[PDB]
Structures are given as C-alpha cells and as structure tokens.
Design a protein around this ligand. Structure first.
Ligand code: FMN
Lengths: 1005, 1005
C-alpha cells in the first residue's frame, strides 16, 4: 500500500505555486527581471507614449466610481466626524457624516434620502463635483497616510442604488392636503432654463407645496450643461433623466422650445400673464470668443466648445434628442485652447471622435491650470500633450482646411502682469482647432428680455448674494448666470437658496408671513410612510430600537436626547437600593482586539469592567417620572438589581414601578453562593422573578447572561417565575488581551490589575443570535428583547427574524452617537418596503444582485471576451483593450422610466418576527445528498490566489492556479466546504452551486 | 427639585457641536460657502500658485512614509497573494507577501529580516524605489478602487523599526567556525566603489563566508549616489550609515581615498598584489555635458548635477563629510535641464538653497518625462514650472553672470524623429542654470585602469547579463557602470547576482565545486539564536506553535507540509471508529460577520458546521506512523472521539497509541447540562478515566467554552487522569441571516442550517479567559491554547496566561502554512527584546509612540507647542510660517553602537503564567487610584469622536473647539476610557493618574 501522508504527482503539481518559505536568497538577473516585469503590469507604463484607441468609446472613466464592495470599505473607513469639515466644505451642506454612516450600515436608501434632501441633483454631483476643491478638500482623513475619503464616489454609489430601486419622490407627508393649501401656493411660478439651478429651485418650491411651477427651456432637451456638454463618459445621460423625473414627481412642469428673449418670453410678458415670481437660470449661453478665429467654420476644422461638445453629446447620449446623429469626424492633430473643465472635456471628447493627437494649449503655465487635478488627470492619462505659455495669433488654412496655428510666447513680469513676446513664436501643425475659453451672456435680445433688472460691472444680472433676488423683488436668479461660481453643486445651491426667498416673497404678496428661520423640506418617498411600530408584552413601541442599560444611558439627560433623536425606547443604567451603592474604577472600558489593530470607527467589540449605576435610585426614579411625563410614547424600562433577597427585590421593583416606568428589566449579574451569578442558576432566576411578579403589576423582563451552558433553561425559569419576557443577552465574559510585558488592559492602579470583563459588540453577535434563536424555538411567543452586536437596520432585522420583538443597542452608539437611530429607522422602512417589490426579488435587502465587474465598473459583455482567459494585466490587458476598441468601432458602423409599485402588502414588524426559525434545526435535518461546489467568475477575479491557498493548506487541493494568467479554476475534487468563497476579496466572485457530478466523500482508506 | 433629566446651561453649551439629525434642509448661500471653505482646507489649494518657503528645509517629503498606525492598516489590507506579482516585479525578488504579513502581525523584526535577506539596502530602497514602475506596478490590488499597496512605505517602516532596535547582523549560524573554513574563503577580494552595487556584492560574499573583502572608495564618504546626490528630504543619510554598518558587522573593510585609475589602483596592480577577484561598481562618475555650456563657472551661475547635488548633500547631511559646508546660495530664477530623477532632485534641492522660482526644461514633451509620476509630483507640488519641447542654444552671459538662456523649439514627425525649429526661439531669463542630462564614464585614466576587459558600443564594461562577469574571468561588474538600469534596487541586485558567480569562480580557482542551484544565504541577527522550545507533559516541542485539529489538518499530507514548513506540532483531524463514520454537508464553512462587510484577508472569525474527519481511523493511524517516522522531533497528537462508551474509547485510544502518536486529544463534542459530553463534569471525568487506563502516552481533554464553569470541566478531566487540557473548542453560534431570513451556511433546497462553531480572533477573549481561569484554578496543569491565535504577539498573550503550547486554525485558513516562519521569528524577537534595557519603553516590537502627523515626527519648536494650531486652514499656514522661520534660524546656527542583552533572554518556561499575578476579583481593584484622559493635540486629527463618545456614551466632559476642532478633556472626566478606545490615532489619548479631587456622580445626594 501507498504513503498516505504524501501528495501524489498530480497534487504536487497542483500545489506548484503554493507559498513555501525559501531557505535561501533568490537569484534572478536584472535583465531577466526587466523581461518578466511586463507580464504582470497592472498600472500605466510610464514608457508608453500612446494610450489605447478610444474612438466611440464612452465607457465610464471616472476614478471615483465605486461598486458595493469598494463603497462598503470606504464608508467603513470614514471617521463620521462631529461638525464635519467636509460638510462645511460642501456648497449644499450635505450631511456627509450621516449618509456615509448609512452606507457603512448597508442602508443605501437612507443614504440617498439624506443626499437628495439637501441636493436634488445628488447623483450628478457625486459624479462630477470637483471634490478636491470642495468637500474632500476639508476631510480630516487627509491627515492620515491613506488619505481623504472618496465622498463623491460614495454619494454616487448610494444614489445609483436608490435609482435602481425605482422609487418615486412624494409630496411631504406632513403638508396639508393639496385642496387645503392656502391660495398663495397656487401662485404661478416661472423658471427660465432647465439646468441644475432651475431644477433645484423648482424642486424645493414644489417641496414647500407650490402647485403651479413651470420651467421654460430654450432647447428641445433638458438638463442644461449636464446634458449638452459634460461627456457621457463622466456623466451618463440616464442620471440626468432620473433626477428630472424625480422633480416631475412633485408636479413641476417643463416646456421646451420656449426662450427668454425679446419678442418671445420676457419678464414683462410673464408679469402680464399673471406669473407671481420668476427665477432666471439660463446660465451663460454663448462661447467666449477670440477675434483671430473670426470667419472660421466647422468645415475648415474650427469649433468653439459650444459647437463641439453638444455635437458629441447628441451622438453619444441616447435619449437626449430624437435625432440619430453621427459623431463629429475629427481627423489628425487637434488643438484645444483653454485651461478649465471645458478645455479638458473637449480634449478627451476629441479622442472619442477619432483624433490622432490632442494638444491642450494654455496662455499661462501648468501651475495656473484652473481645472482640478482630478479633471486634468483624465486628459493626461489619455496622453494629451500640454503646451504652456501660449497665445494664439493666426490660423493657417489650406485646401479649405486648417493646417496650422501660429502662437506667440507669454511671460509673467516683475509685476504680476502677463505679457506676450512677439519675437518668440510657434508654428503648430493642426487639422482641428477647438476654442474652450469659457462662456458668457451676450445676446442683446436675451438681456433686453430681462428689463428692467439691474446688471453689474460684468454685464450679468445683479443679485443679493443671500436672497438671490434681483433689483425687481419678484425676480430671482442663480447658477452660472450670476457669475459667482462654475460648478453644478453651487448652481444647485443657488436654486436652493433662492427657493426660500421666493417662498417668502410670494407668501408676503398674499399677506402671509414665514418663519424667521429657513425651513426647506427634506426629500421624501413612499418608503417613509412604512410603519415600523411593534407591540410586545402589552407595550407599544413606535419603533423597535432602544438603548440598552449601559454607558449610553449613564444619565437620564442622555436618554432625553436619545428620545429627542427618535429612539423608540431606553433602559436606565442598572440601579439599586442605597445600601448597594458602588464605586467604579478606571480605566474600565476598552476597545476590542477582536479584529486586529484597526483603530477609530467600527470597533468590533468593547470590554468593560463597569458596575451598576453610581447614581441613586432616587435620581433614577425621579428621572423616569420626568422622562415619561415628557415622552409618553417612548418606552422607558427601569433596569434594577438586588442581592438574592426577597424584600430587596420587592422594595426596589415597587419603587421603580411607582416612578411610572413602563416595565422593569431585572439584571441577573449579582453574585451568590451553576456559576457565581444569579443569572447562571435557573432556581435563583425563577425565585427572583417570582418575588418581582408578586410585587408589581407592570411587565418585567429578566436579562439573561450568555455565560451559561443552557440559556434556555434560564429563560424557561424566568417564564415559570412570572417574567413577561427575557432580554438576551448581557455581555460575554472575557479577557480582551495583554501587553507584551504581560500586563492587562484595562490595567487598574499601580499594580496594573484587572478582572474578567464583559465583551460587547459585533464580536458577540453570533452568540446573541444563537441565544435569541434557541429561546424563540423553545419558548414560542415568549417576548424577547435582543441585545448583542446590533448596529444597523439589517442586523436588527436578523434578530427580528430570529424571534426578537425589540432591539437594544449599546456598542453601536459607543462607536458613534445617538443619531444612528435615523439610519436604523429609514433602513428598516426600506428593508420592509422592498419586500413588496416583485421586480427586486433578486436583491438581498438593499443590495442589488452583484453584476460581473472590475473596480466597480461593469464588465463588457462582448462575445470576443467571455471565456478568453484574459486577466486584467500585462499582455492580456492589452488584448482586452484591443477587443473592446474593435467592439466600439463595430457599434459605430451600426447606427422609459416607470416606478415600481408594491404588489403585496408591506410587511409589519409583527409579520417578520421569527420567520427565520423555519430554517433552523438539528444537523440531522440537513441534507448530505444536496452537495455544492464552488464556481469562480473569471471576469470578477483579481488574481490573488487566496482561494487557492485556502484550499491548499485548509482544504482539498482542488483549485488549479494558472502560472501565467493567475486565474483559478475549481476542479471536480471540490467538496464544497466553502472556505474559498469565504476568503475571496471580491463579493460574489465565487458562488456555491448544486453539484452535478457524482459525489463521494474522501475516506483516505 | 431641579429637572434631573435635563442638561443644565453649561452642558448644553458643551454639547453645542454634538451631532443631531436635522428636520429640514440647510440654507447657506454660495457666497457664504466660498468664504467658509478656506477655514477647513486640508489639501493643496489649486488656486495657490506660490510655493511655501522651503529654504534650508530638509524635512521628509515622501508621500509613502508610514507610521505604525498607518503601516498596520496598509499591511492588513494587502491580500498576501500566492506567487505574488509584486515580488515578480521586484528586481531583488523580495518576498513581499511574507514581510507584509509579518508587519500585519506586528512582527517588525521578521519583516525586516525577510527584507534584508534579499536586499542589503532594504531601508534605502523602501524610501527611494520607483515602485510604480516596479513592485507596485504589478500589485493585484490595483484592480480595486482603493488601489495598490504602498509596498515601499511598508518596507521602510519595518526596516526603520529594526534600525531602532539597534541589533547587529551576524555571521550565518550554520557556517563552520571561521577557523574551520576552507582556504578558498580567505581569498583576497576587492570591490571598487562604495555604492549600492558593491555594498550588496560585498554583503553577500561575506554571508558566504569570505573573510578578506575590501571596498576601495574614491571619495572620503561612502554610500555612492545614495549619499552624494539623493536629497536628504527623500533619503536621510542615517539610513545609509545604518546599512553600511550592518555590512561591516560581517567584516567587510572599506578604504576611502583610493581610486581605480591608471596611476593608482588598476586591475593589474590588484592582480599583482594577490587579489583573486574584483567587482567594479564605480557607477557613472561624470556628468553628461553639452557643448554650449563650455567655460561656464559656478560663480557665473552654472552647475552640472554632479557639481550641485553633492554641494547640497554635504551641507544637509550631518555625518557625510568631516568638516561643515555651507548651503549653495541660489538666488533668483533657476533653470534645470533634464527629465529624469536627477533633474527633479536638482529642482527641489534648488528651492532649499533659496531659489525664488524653478523651471524644469525638457527637450521633449510632458508625456516623455523619464522620472516616475511619484518623483515628478514632488517638484510639481512645490510649484516648479515645466517647459516642454525645449532645446538650449545659448547662455546669455552679461557682467560675468548668466542672465538668460536662449532655446529653440523642438518637435516630432512621422516616424517620431526629433527636430529643432531654428526660427522658433525662446529667451528665458534666469540667474542659475543646472544641467541634469545624466551621467557617463569618460575619464580615460579610469577606463585604462580596467585594461584589458572588453568595452561595448556604449563604451562601458561588457558583462554577461547572467553572471555579471567581464571578459576577464576574475573581474565582475554591476550597477550603473554596466548601463543596463538606473535604480538603487537594480544595482543592489547586480551585486547580489555577481556575488554568486564570484563565489563560483573563486571556489573553482581553489579546486572546489559549488551547487548547480544558487544558494545565497539569508540575513541573520542574534535574535535568530533565541531558543523557543518548550516542554509540556513530558513532551518536547521545538517551538510552541501547532495546527489545531481542523480544516488545515484535513489530510495527513497537509500535516507533512506543515512540518516541512516548520510547525512544532500538529493535531490530526478528529477521527473515530468505523461504526461512527460520518458524511459532511456543504456549504459548511463561512466567513465571520463579526467585523462588518470586510472581505478578503484577516477575517475576524469563521463559523463551521463540519463534523469529524471523513477519513478512516486506519488512514489516520497509518498516517501518524508515517509522520512520526519522517518527523521524529515534531509532535503529532491524535484527536479522537467516541460516543459515551467505555469499550469504544479504550479501543480507539489504544489504536491511536499503537500508531506511534506522541499524545492523544479527546474531542468532547459528542452528544451523550447541555447535550455534549464536554458540558458535563461527570461524563468528562469518566471518559478520561477510560482512556487513562487504556493508554500510557499523555492525553489532553479538549474543552468546550459553551459551559457555565469551564474550570469544573477541566478539574473533572484532571481527576480523570488527563495530562492536560486544550482550551478551547469553538463557540456555539449563528453567524447571520440574509435579508430574506435564510441562513448562511444554507444547506439543500430547504436552505437549512444548524448552530455552528465560531472560531478566530472574535473568540479570543473567551479563550483567553478560559486559559487564565483554568491556569489560576489548576496551577501547573498543562494547557494547550486555541482560539484566535494569529501571531507571535497573540501567542505570547496565551503563554503569559498559562498555556504551554499554541494551537492554530483560523489564521491558517486566512492564509497558509508559511505563517509559521512569522510566528517563530516574532516570538524570538519578543523574547530577545526583553533583555534589552534601552528598549524597555517599547511594547513588544512597537517603539513608544512619538507625537506625529501622518507618521512624520512633529517639529518640537517652542513657538508651536501649545499654540492651538491644527493642521488645516489658516492655522496650517501659520504652522508653515513658523517652521520656515525655524529652518532659517537653524541655518543661522552652523556613532552607531549595538545594544547588548543585559539580562538572560527568557525561555518559554520563564514567561508562562506571568500575567496571572495581575488577575483577580473586582474587589482587588483600587477604586481610589483613578485616571483621566489626556489628549496630545499635536497628534489629533480633529474628528471629534472622543467628543461624540463622551457625549452620548459618557459624561459630557470634553470641549470641542468650534474653530480649531481641537478637543480638551475637562475636570468632569471619570476615566471610563471610551474616548481613548474610539480614537483613530494610536496613543493620541492616554490615561493618566488623576491629580484633582475625585467624587462619583450620584445624581441626587
Ligand atoms: C472548519 C473547522 C473544522 C474544525 N474541526 C475540528 C475537529 O475535527 N476537532 C476539534 O477538536 N476541533 C475542530 N475545530 C476547532 C479547532 O481545532 C479550533 O479549536 C478552533 O477553530 C479555535 O481555533 P482558531 O481560533 O485558531 O480557529 C474546527 C474548526 C474549524 C474552523
């Protein structure tokens, strides 16, 4: 017979690339290394002077785009700062802390709601905001080596998921019915220009209740520059359409083919027609021109950005127009003049039109570029050449075509003045010239249509920077036309700012006043109407979330603020009779070491050696009376503890009941004598519950410790004793760790002493979930208040599904603050709402089904790629690029949005409780016939070989790892243990599927 | 009475910036936002065209430098890939996977050892390698949004900590005594030039045993370009000195003031003197010059990089030269000609000399820049202006000074071909001109000294790319002189490559052969001599680490490979008699959800529903016989399980003993106070009694943590005759449910599951408590620890807790068997460091945390400390001004010895149970020795997490400044320690003895 403990030839071969520590230094010549390097190349090659062909390629090129995997990582990284500087640096004042917290908790709906509440064009902005000069520029994490947070990408991700949910925006639920609205809200309102500014203004006015809002747009398309000029490869047109439809959900009307101009629409005609207010948001309609380009035509090869970009947009944005137009034929060398976003977008867009080479020419130096570094990077990575200190002087035309442009050198003198050197010239060959100096408002007919408002020095409408009001009280203006800023978000903010004062003005015209403090409404959807209340043990909870008896309930003043924030209920820190007064030691609460040396947000656990409340029973009882008086609908549960003494338990419970507590929670941590604690002995628990039951009439719950062999026996004892339910569970006994010198942490006093503490947080969730599930199955219907690692609506729902009715939280608040309640509530509403949407059954909660991707970007479904074994690196990547380019050329030759409606009642909390219990059982109830095997999606793989390493040293050596492509392949020896899927860095790259081939366990002999 | 549940004015004030969800959208004008943005600005302002003052400022400007906090985060992020592409892309073939794994496990020594084993200039390279064109360029994580790993920074960090340990390099321990070495090793060896190439070559030759190695250096200083030209602000001179001294530890001699030149040292004179081999590593000594600069002097303002950089280095690098030297007085506009590293370093260095403005002039375009993006970024961020397509023609000299440089425009045609346009000129004003075209070897005297070796077309020494041998068999060459590459790492590799063939050549000259397979020695230090063996229950373990009975021991072939890797011991997967045969289900092993949606490396836990081994007892017994036959020194423990039956346990135990197992481990998971035998003291006692009377070898009872009192079970096992206990098995739990209520793992069409066992770091607190409580209750009773052991550090925690050996499962599932190397070097280092008196302030391998920002030391300037100047907005501007003034003040103001153990290095037996002295009851903790939190404002990153945690989970004791976002702990602090626990910056907050009167908050008197 064979050497059983040895790998046969076949296995030794499959293990060829398995890591093995070397006993000697390696020997590889420098020449050999130079030759091997190209095979594994992932990033750009600095020695490569030409970037792949991009003709007709409008694929997303943003470096900030995130997929779910990446978004969760980045969201978890965010410090979720107080008085956040990023928010202060955001023109629309987005509550970044809150929306990123929501993303980290997988509550994409809540994140999107927060985003759109302050920015109606939340998705567009996430994609195009020059964050380095805005929110990200103020990020505290810039002070770390890893750097600032990708705020834009996170905003984009949450907004994209919300868009995919196809949920409509609704009228504010707290507004009176449309027919009960004061006459003033029917005032005819007009907005000129359907760009970011007007879309934002109209949206906020609609939120306030105005029912007659009309945006008059000159063109046949809507969205402004977001549609007509920003490239499809930066901002997909479907994003613009999505935001406009959300606005239309509020009743805003849009009429195209209508222009603000003499003989057409004017302020006078609007006033004559009965309009009560007007918002001017027409932007800067004309290109900034240069005399030297006079007379040049497109046929000769000359374009202004205003000519060029819309042509490319109309050809690349399906839905923009009804016309099916061809992409501008740009052949040869292209010269783009300018240093702002316009210039860089013209440069990159020129490449999509077939340009062989592109030159970005600046009048000043590289240091003076106006576009943010991130925008510049897109042109630079696509090999556009930059030529600084250049001023155009002449354009040479031959054979009806531009063939060159002559420039003069420019300089900065000992004064700060820019001069041109006539004797120093440049003759640059070029076939196409695109002027991208910027835009302005010149049309005399448009200016005349704005009579008689005052215009400033810059010949632009003058407005009060705070109210956005022009010299005419009923006319306001915002966006590019005001000339203060040139960003989508600032234009959106201008409309937002204007909406409040337009509201104030209109109300005043109808003899009504408005609050001195601005009150623009938030963003709402049907999800917000979802009822998340629940009844348990005769008590009505407005929502299932509450504060556990712990550090967050150290003082009643804290509970008050928690109720003000929206928490459904709260436990007082555990208190006792005066004779049981205690004194805490310090340090006493430490971070968990359960997930490695990761500091800051999201600690996976905490350990504490804290005692009961140091505050008296008198303080707590009076506090309870105060809290119940001010928050009658918020449930207050008094947590109490006594030694094993009947008179004490009856005295304290009665005192707590007399204070007005809705219920009591009995802390069974007091030692005695099965263990040392009362909560570890069924007999003691039964008696304690009996004493309390005969002492009070209100409901009471026994808080169980997980530190027992059979927690069900304790729960049963409590039930037999008269308890109305149980709280599962308290903290897990443990020792968090020791320093290298052997001393503990926490370390108390000069002696550096410690004692076993209680572990809390996500690290103990598996223990708490098992406890809740086992009790729910053994004692059906017996109320369970869950506690142990609840830190999101998703995790909360897991406990509800496991049999719990309400959810207590401690560690999640210690890791953050009381505002997480907003996230938990919107998150739970969303989870319940989605269960009624038939079209989204493939999603896992708020997570869309994972689509094949790389870096969060969808993988091209080209027949010429699937199954080609072409990883994203080295020569293989070059091949992929060639195939994609050919596909784009092939697509070139070859030349609606409805909201989902619930198709079933939205489940209430009571309808989901215990629903997961049906899947639990004994091991014997599990099928050993229905086996599975792992299957890898090569298109999502990042070639790390972790699946391979795990199967090799922790599995069945069933994966082949290719030595050239670093692509893994699961073979037929797979047993479906699932370890590979469990260690894979890419979500859903590996999936377990039903085994189709014969299965037979490996018996060795 | 007052309203107890309400915050008084004072507290309401302190809570002013505490987060509170808003009920309405915010209103802030665009103008207001523009004005407020500047206050919080962290990153560079794109509108700022003037670079900060950098005169005489040589502070580290590398973006890759990491501090411990940052290094740990990045190391944990690394996928630690199989057949890693980063290593393949590293010229010295560094085992990046392994050294980064060591860093993630806090084993900086092991990381440094791995680095230096393949690269003698590991620290220099970590700091200067153009990683984007090397290792990082092939990083698999480039395929994720977050991007590739900062490999260089990690290498730099580990190497810096090692440098701080001040541990010397030693001769290979396995080499024969110096006196027993064959005569061949005394062969006189000469190396020319003390740069990276020669330092590397000499180092490896010394490792091989050569005792007469001399490097002859022309200059008075050593280190080559690392010393003479690379800026101090990129590569501190102390780094070079450190690596030089490590080499000298091996006996290599360096003689300065000796040149390879016709009238001095020549190949002929060396041969005449008896030298047996010579390595030429003199680099490229002369600057590449241009005819137009002929005659220009430094006084006129002209320098070549070879003139300039050494001048700056000599004045900025303390220790480089004997006497002090002044910083070149560079005033006015500076023109730097070139596009490689040389040019960019000249540009940045010019600013340190006082340059007002710097222009980098390129003959080609920006796209053609030779330096990697990361090098270019340093000059660009310092506002250097770049002028492309420029070729110098004349240096206008008036009044004995350069006043300008006249250039001609350049361009590229059809076949690339570079032309110069004579009619297109530029007259650029400048006061200083620095040519940085590169370097060459031209000195006829030096070339003649190399007679008669063959030179190639490039007039450089010709060498075989594989052996580095010249036309003369006894002469080799490497580094810049060969002209193949221009990087420190490639030069180091050239010397490394040459060392093996020099060795082969010398041995052959003495009539000795060498292995066909290259065998360069690894890097060693005294730490490697540390004994980590331990004896337990009469068994001798070569090291305390072993594989737990689990997935990593699924097959005996795997245990074999584990022993080959170096694991001290291993458990077989639990096996039973034929009648108890089982069949596993699938899926059965899933990742933990204990630390959020973080995928890939370092899962914080796993859950499994796996059964005992599916392989027969016959297979395992034969396997044990085989394993013990081949690995007699590695301990093999047979894990067995039977139902509650005497005959069965006696039969199986005897069968396992007969196979040759060193010991047995009894799995007490079989259902027979719970449902398992391990949960009942009576059953455990009996089972152990049966086995005790059946076998003579030692046996250990594996305890389950799922019990009220684990000590009672351990005691039962001891009373039953067990020789020790294994604490502990997995924790019972449910890892989680999907949003639809289905579990994971989900088995079969019914998507069923059952309670599984949780393993990994998430259960370490439970296992640590178990080990410590058992160790305290049963002094001296052997304990084998299991539960979250994933590093030498964590292993030491268990040893300190009372365990003698350490079992591992999850850490291997997360990686592979090679972690054993990390654990062993890590434990050796931890024990070694305990003997170093000067490092007592360190926590294990972690140096005391110094005040820093982004890992860089905070300047200790009197006008900075206590100024309340955070690192953002106007405050940052002030800080920079203060620092610049300090640098000017410093301008106004014109040995490395190894630590020696001063106590015996502790053996494992000396550390076991040392932590027990600190554990006790809560009553044994002092409630009088209280502490309070103290924040180091210089380390703060202004997130406000301490503030939020104290507000909603504490005592509202922290003031958070509304302008500086700096926190201040007030006297109401109770020392609970939550703030310190949530702070993202390691050691920013520290707990200190309270000095002011302490009185517990009672709420009511
Ligand atoms: C997939 C898997 C299989 C296991 N199989 C066994 C087994 O057969 N016998 C046993 O005594 N313990 C078994 N264990 C438990 C381990 O030996 C070890 O006690 C546990 O995982 C705790 O250590 P860790 O934190 O290093 O993983 C298993 C654990 C896992 C994850």
């Amino acid at each position: 017979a064979p050497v059983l403990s040895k790998d046969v030839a076949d296995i030794e071969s499959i293990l060829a690339l398995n890591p093995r520590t070397q006993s000697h230094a390696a020997l590889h010549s420098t020449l050999a290394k130079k030759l091997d390097k190209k095979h594994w190349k992932r990033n750009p090659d600095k020695n490569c002077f030409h970037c792949e062909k991009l003709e007709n390629n409008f694929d997303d090129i943003k470096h900030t785009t995130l997929g779910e995997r990446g978004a969760l990582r980045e969201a978890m990284r965010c410090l979720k700062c107080a008085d956040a500087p990023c928010q202060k640096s955001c023109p629309t004042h987005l509550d970044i802390k809150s929306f990123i917290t929501s993303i980290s908790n997988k509550n994409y709906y809540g994140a999107a709601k927060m985003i759109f509440s302050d920015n109606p064009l939340g998705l567009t902005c996430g994609m195009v905001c020059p964050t380095s000069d805005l929110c990200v520029g103020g990020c505290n994490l810039y002070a770390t080596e890893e750097g600032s947070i990708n705020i834009g990408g996170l905003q984009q991700f949450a907004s994209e998921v919300f868009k995919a949910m196809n949920i409509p925006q609704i009228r504010n639920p707290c507004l009176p019915s449309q027919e009960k609205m004061p006459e003033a809200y029917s005032a005819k309102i007009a907005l000129l220009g359907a760009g970011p500014a007007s879309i934002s203004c109209a949206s906020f006015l609609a939120r306030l209740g105005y029912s007659d809002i009309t945006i008059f747009e000159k063109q046949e398309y809507v969205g402004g520059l977001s549609t007509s000029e920003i490239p499809q490869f930066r901002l997909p047109y479907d994003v613009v359409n999505f935001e406009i439809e959300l606005m239309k959900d509020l009743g805003v009307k849009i009429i195209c083919g209508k222009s603000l101009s003499e003989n057409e629409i004017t302020l006078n005609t609007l006033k004559e027609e009965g309009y009560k207010a007007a918002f001017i948001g027409i932007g800067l309609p004309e290109p900034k021109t240069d005399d030297i380009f006079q007379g040049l035509t497109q046929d000769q090869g000359f374009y202004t950005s205003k000519d060029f970009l819309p042509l490319v947009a109309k050809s690349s944005k399906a839905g923009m127009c009804a016309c099916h137009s061809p992409l501008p034929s740009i052949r040869g060398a292209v010269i783009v003049l300018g240093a702002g976003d316009t210039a860089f977008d013209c440069a990159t867009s020129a490449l999509r039109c077939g340009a062989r080479r592109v030159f970005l020419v600046f009048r000043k130096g590289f240091v003076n570029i106006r576009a943010v570094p991130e925008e510049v990077e897109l042109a630079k990575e696509e090999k556009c050449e930059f030529l600084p200190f250049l001023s155009p002087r002449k354009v040479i035309v031959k054979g009806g075509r531009i063939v060159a442009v002559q420039f003069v050198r420019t300089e900065q003198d000992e004064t700060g003045k820019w001069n041109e050197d006539e004797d120093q010239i440049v003759h640059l060959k070029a076939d196409v010239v695109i002027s991208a100096f910027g835009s302005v408002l010149r049309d005399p007919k448009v200016k005349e249509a704005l009579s008689p408002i005052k215009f400033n020095r810059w010949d632009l409408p003058e407005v009060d920077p705070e109210t956005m009001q022009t010299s005419e009280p009923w006319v306001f203006a915002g966006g590019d036309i005001v000339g203060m800023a040139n960003t989508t978000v600032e234009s959106v903010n201008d409309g937002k700012q204007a909406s409040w004062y337009i509201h104030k003005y209109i109300q005043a015209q109808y003899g009504a006043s408005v609050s001195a403090k601005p009150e623009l409404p938030l963003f709402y959807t049907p999800v917000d109407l979802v009822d998340i209340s629940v009844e348990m043990a005769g008590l009505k909870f407005i929502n299932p979330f509450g504060l556990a008896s712990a550090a967050p309930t150290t003082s009643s003043s804290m509970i008050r603020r928690a109720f003000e924030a929206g928490w459904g209920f709260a436990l007082t820190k555990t208190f006792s009779l005066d004779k049981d007064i205690v004194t805490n030691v310090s340090p006493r609460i430490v971070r968990g070491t359960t997930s490695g040396p990761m500091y800051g947000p999201g600690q996976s656990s905490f350990l504490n050696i804290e005692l009961i409340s140091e505050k008296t029973a008198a303080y707590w009882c009076q506090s309870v009376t105060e809290l119940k008086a001010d928050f009658p609908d918020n449930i207050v549960i008094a947590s109490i503890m006594c030694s094993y003494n009947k008179n004490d338990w009856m005295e304290l419970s009665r005192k707590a009941e007399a204070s007005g507590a809705d219920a009591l929670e009995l802390n069974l941590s007091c030692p005695h004598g099965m263990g040392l604690a009362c909560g570890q002995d069924p007999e003691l628990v039964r008696n304690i519950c009996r004493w309390v039951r005969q002492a009070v009439q209100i409901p009471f719950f026994a808080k169980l410790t997980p530190n027992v062999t059979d927690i069900v026996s304790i729960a049963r004892a409590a039930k037999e004793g008269g308890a109305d339910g149980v709280t599962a569970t308290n903290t897990v006994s443990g020792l968090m760790g020791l320093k290298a010198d052997g001393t503990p942490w926490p370390a108390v006093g000069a002696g550096k002493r410690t004692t076993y503490g209680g572990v809390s947080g996500t690290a103990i969730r598996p223990i708490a979930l098992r406890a809740v599930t086992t009790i729910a199955r053994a004692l059906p219907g017996f109320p369970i208040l869950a506690t142990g690692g609840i830190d999101s609506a998703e995790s909360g729902l897991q406990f509800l599904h496991s049999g719990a009715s309400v959810l207590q939280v401690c560690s999640a608040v210690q890791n953050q603050d009381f505002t997480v309640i907003q996230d938990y509530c919107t998150g739970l509403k969303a989870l319940l709402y989605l269960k009624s949407i038939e079209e989204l059954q493939g999603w896992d909660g708020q997570s869309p089904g994972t689509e094949s991707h790389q870096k969060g970007k969808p993988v091209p479904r080209i027949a010429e790629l699937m199954g080609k074994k072409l990883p994203n690196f080295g020569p293989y990547l070059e091949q992929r690029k060639k195939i994609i380019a050919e596909e784009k050329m092939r697509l070139k030759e070859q030349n609606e949005r409805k909201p989902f409606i619930p198709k079933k009642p939205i489940p209430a909390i009571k309808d989901v409780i215990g629903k997961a219990l049906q899947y639990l059982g004994t091991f014997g109830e599990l099928s050993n016939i229905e086996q599975v095997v792992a299957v890898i999606d090569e298109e999502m793989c990042i070639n790390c070989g972790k699946c391979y390493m795990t199967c090799n040293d922790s599995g069945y050596q069933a994966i082949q790892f290719d030595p050239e492509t670093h692509l893994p392949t699961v073979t037929d020896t797979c047993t479906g243990c699932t370890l590979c899927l469990s260690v894979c860095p890419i979500i859903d790259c590996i999936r377990m599927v039903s085994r189709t081939t014969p299965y037979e366990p490996k018996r060795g002999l």
